[PDB]
Amino acid sequence: KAKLRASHTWNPIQQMSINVDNQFNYVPSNIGGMKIVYEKSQLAPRKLY
Amino acid sequence: GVGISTGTFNNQTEFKFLENGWVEITANSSRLVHLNMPESENYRRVVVNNMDKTAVNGNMALDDIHAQIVTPWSLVDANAWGVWFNPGDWQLIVNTMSELHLVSFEQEIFNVVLKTVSETKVYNNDLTASLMVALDSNNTMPFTPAAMRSETLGFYPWKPTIPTPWRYYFQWDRTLIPSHTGTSGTPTNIYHGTDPDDVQFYTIENSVPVHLLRTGDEFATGTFFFDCKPCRLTHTWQTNRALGLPPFLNSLPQSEGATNFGDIGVQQDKRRGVTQMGNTNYITEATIMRPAEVGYSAPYYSFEASTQGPFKTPIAAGRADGNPRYAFGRQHGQKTTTTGETPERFTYIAHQDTGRYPEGDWIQNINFNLPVTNDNVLLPTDPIGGKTGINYTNIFNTYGPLTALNNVPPVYPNGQIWDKEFDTDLKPRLHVNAPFVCQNNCPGQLFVKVAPNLTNEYDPDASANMSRIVTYSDFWWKGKLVFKAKLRASHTWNPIQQMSINVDNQFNYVPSNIGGMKIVYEKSQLAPRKLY
Amino acid sequence: GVGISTGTFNNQTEFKFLENGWVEITANSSRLVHLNMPESENYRRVVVNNMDKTAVNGNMALDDIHAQIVTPWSLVDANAWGVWFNPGDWQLIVNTMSELHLVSFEQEIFNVVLKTVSETKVYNNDLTASLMVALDSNNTMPFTPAAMRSETLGFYPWKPTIPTPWRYYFQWDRTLIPSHTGTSGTPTNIYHGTDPDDVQFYTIENSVPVHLLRTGDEFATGTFFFDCKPCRLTHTWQTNRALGLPPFLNSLPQSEGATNFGDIGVQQDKRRGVTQMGNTNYITEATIMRPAEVGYSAPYYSFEASTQGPFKTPIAAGRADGNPRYAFGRQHGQKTTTTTPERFTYIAHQDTGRYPEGDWIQNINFNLPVTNDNVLLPTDPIGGKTGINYTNIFNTYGPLTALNNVPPVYPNGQIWDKEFDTDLKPRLHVNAPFVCQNNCPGQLFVKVAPNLTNEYDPDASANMSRIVTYSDFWWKGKLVFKAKLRASHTWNPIQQMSINVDNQFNYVPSNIGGMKIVYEKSQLAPRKLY
Amino acid sequence: DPDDVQFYTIENSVPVHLLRTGDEFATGTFFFDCKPCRLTHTWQTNRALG
Amino acid sequence: GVGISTGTFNNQTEFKFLENGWVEITANSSRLVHLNMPESENYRRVVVNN
């Protein structure tokens, strides 16, 4: 059970995204080679005080 | 009462969630609008003619001939994405939604301050004169979206704004024969005035009931509920080559790496399939039958002439032709502390991936002898009409019944939201300049003017312009634009492209040390969609 | 009473006002119809082949080669504007109405009388033989509108009329390779024949029930009910240049005068706006983005060939090409007391046209004072032929095109037309303002029955011996329209149609009783596109 | 290009039934809404109209 | 179970005639489908380049 976020601030926040570097980590090779690479979990900033 | 306030400032973009994955996005917005009195109180027909620039041969595209009624009314136009959503809100919208309906739109004006100036300068509040406001609910006046000229309300809530002074096109007739530099004689370049069958001269005064607001009263625009179709925040990557079942690869690779390609194991002329080519045995990925045509070629940089002068043909989707280019000022994205009259510009290179690459076309004979000879193929390098630059793709149209197209994407912050459907008996299928096309009616324009503060001496008999006490207005506008939006789902193993802050774009989204700010353009259709 | 009328003659136009500015217009119309008996009683498969005129090199466009089934029947076709309105009511309609709906329609036949000739010529009545009447209610028969040939019923209420001898096309196959004057030899120009899969021979007797009317009875139609979309009696003037917000001027004119033009203050590369040109910084009225395209270029005077020979490509709009030209006779508006057709070309106010001599395409690089090699003008020979420029082969129809339905043409214009029974249907028909959504009213077919002699036998190869016979009958129809009254949104007046000093003598008859109906514009008032 | 990558897998996208020798799988009745396909052809070129 | 059949082969075409000149064509079809195991159990990404 999870809550959805809200855009509290003017600026955008960091988000996970496929780009030209990590593209082939998420699709199989030409002889069936797959892999799973680590993803960060706590991207968005939060106000502590 | 003068001393009692009449509203509340609001810019909160509320996100109210619903069952079945729908979200009611509620973009409140409000601005301070500064209005001076008109330069002249009279409607004035004006004709522009840059004959000096246009008469030079080869400068045909610089034709700026037009006739217009310069009007003593200012337009308050909130039809632009930057007026409503901030960069964080647009990040949330593009990354998490999938579709985006237009639901409702209303406005109001409150806290009207009216001021007069006397000579050093001394400012005094005027508690007697009033602001004139008019709402064209029936859309009797000509429709004039300010987004195309970059004169909507400013995007920063914390900076005052100004409304654009309204004007609209008269009729005119003009012909301009085209000519290249070094032609043998001056081409026909003349203005024929205006024909009497097409004359129209509208006025705010006789078209719309005008409301008068002193410093102590409000005006509220009622809710207008749209009928618009869903705008889609996902893009299609499939051209014609990637529709249907791929060919079966008999011999797959046996070692890793890019250099180890698979191979189809069957000779070209002994393959099995359907080809729409009735005199050849070759089944190839180019020749194989597909359901229909994704995208279409069009004559790029083609100008056609009509009664009112020459204009460019619009292309629905581009690859550079077709890709729109937006030029705009400090209110609408450029850095507020930059010095100079040069607008900042970008070209919106869309992800929609439907357009054509015109350097890769060719046409060849019906006989289809395979290693084609020079006489039997027309390449994009061959002249047309002896012109080495203008090859055949500049003339070539392939719009047909089998064409499929996507609507134009949103362009944040300068793009349009809604645009009125034409009055023709036959509609255009899409509009190149807005994602939504309001069909039956489309929200009423709000025109504003400072009422004439006449001097103690006045005579209608005089030929000179009426003398008025110098006067300007500051009024607070508020509007609320409601959207319904569907949240996306993860249909694939891989993650999708998502907007993110990074080290490169980090300083566009926070203010500079001297308080400057900018709003950098922003891709809308990020996630891929399955066309088939 | 046999000698007393079975119905009442009527031509009076009835206007009735409904709520909210709606109005109902009942165009009552009645005509006397004269009908001679058929030249032959049999259907004939006639083939036309003007090889003599076509065979000369360069007369490709003069191909009349076709086949048709010449029937013993005749058609009563009231599908034209002049049949239902006189100049006064059309003037009032086009000056006071903004929209026009086609609502309902009915016919009847009354006061039928049948006569025969004896031999000087002595004319006799025959109350025993019958007129043959049939209405194709189910639209089984081919739809053959007579307005295209100008063979509808006469527009004058008081003169007699005659119905068109009815015929329909029969499938043929033909090739005509084009040639120019000076081609090296005779081109291929032959008539193949007809194909077995496409043969279609209809007959009135087998398809529709035929009523055998005699004097003292009538045929009347149940009123047909249209559902067509409204035609609009107001033209739109705005091309793409006059769409959207104009630019603001930093220098308004300081004094009145024709030569005192206003001026934009900003340099063309330094302006603000949106242009659909990724690699060009100049913002101009030609280059600025517009919501869509108004009108479209199409290849003009282009002829395309299929199985049944070459034909001209129709164009939905025009600026001399594109605009329709009519050629009509005495029954349909020619000056009656004159002894060639009379002609006009409808230069309508609809606009949405193109001016081919002003178009050009230039290279994508857009070196702005464009050199010769980087622009293709309408002066350049395509294919080496100096008369054919690029606009002859140029099509700009696309997803962004917006067009207006064709004007009505008074008095010779057709009112309605039959929607094609293809799967994908055209957006408009270029020969009628209304298109029947599912069915049009049935075609009314008439014929005088065989008045045989005592000498008739079937085995004789000669045509059957028939007594000389004709018939005279009165046709009536009632067409109901519905329309919206216009409103004066605009300050200045509109171009209303009115009698002036030049055109005054066209409305009144001559001293010898002649008359004419001149052509009248339809979409007079202007209208917003936006 | 990374913005167009789409890797679909049958395991992650649909429920998968296991059938041993002795059981069935019955897809429910799917109902169409397609337009009528016509088993007749139109000979009339432009020249044959009117 | 193992030895109890779970369906009936059928390839009849049944023409049921309704009123007002309509015919409901019930096209049945049945095939014995042979299936080998996959060549390799991994999803593969293969480029053809001639």
Automatic annotation (TrEMBL), chain D:
<protein>
    <submittedName>
        <fullName>Capsid protein 2</fullName>
    </submittedName>
</protein>
<comment type="similarity">
    <text>Belongs to the parvoviridae capsid protein family.</text>
</comment>
